[PDB]
Design a protein around this ligand. Sequence first.
Ligand SMILES: NCc1ccccc1
Ligand SMILES: [Ca+2]
Length: 223
Amino acid sequence: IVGGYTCGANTVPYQVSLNSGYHFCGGSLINSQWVVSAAHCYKSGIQVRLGEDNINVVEGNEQFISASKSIVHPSYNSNTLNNDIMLIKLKSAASLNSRVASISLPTSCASAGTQCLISGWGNTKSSGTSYPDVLKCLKAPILSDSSCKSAYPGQITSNMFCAGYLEGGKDSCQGDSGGPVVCSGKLQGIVSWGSGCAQKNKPGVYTKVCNYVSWIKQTIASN
Ligand SMILES: NCc1ccccc1
Ligand SMILES: [Ca+2]
């Protein structure tokens, strides 16, 4: 997250870190045994780390649980990033508490102008590289479909939305991928892609979660 703020320990209780020897992507806990992330975060050997603040220090609220199963969206296209969503099942159910909690799925899509909370352990610099130890946060509005399409000609599908600031300075970044965009207490987006971080006229692009609620629910019901 570039241009954000320190969230505060365990204040984003649905935020998970995906670890394969190191943090490599975010995700969102949606029930005691399932995480939503980005399909482009897929790999084998995932340990889901819940209850994290500093990802380099054991601070006492962590739960580390291996994945038992990954399910990349049936229609994910890694070239266009259309349908950039995957589900991860935990080998055991997480213990839910005030610091480790699921986030509600949308009942309805969100509209441009809605404020949302974006979070992660990704790069905090738009030029160069500095990766934080503690969780970072950014409040950002959803942008209109027309603004998003103007910023990225030929690239925005019905499964994507832009959020952030056209002027630059505030955005998600590499290492935030897969993490949450929460609006009004609902998971509306997944950190997906863009062009660089926090550059003028290049806002972040997010997977539009409301389009996937039926698939998420029916996948969970049979897996
Ligand atoms: N600045 C948007 C973004 C997020 C994650 C990865 C690449 C780009
Ligand atoms: Ca920790």
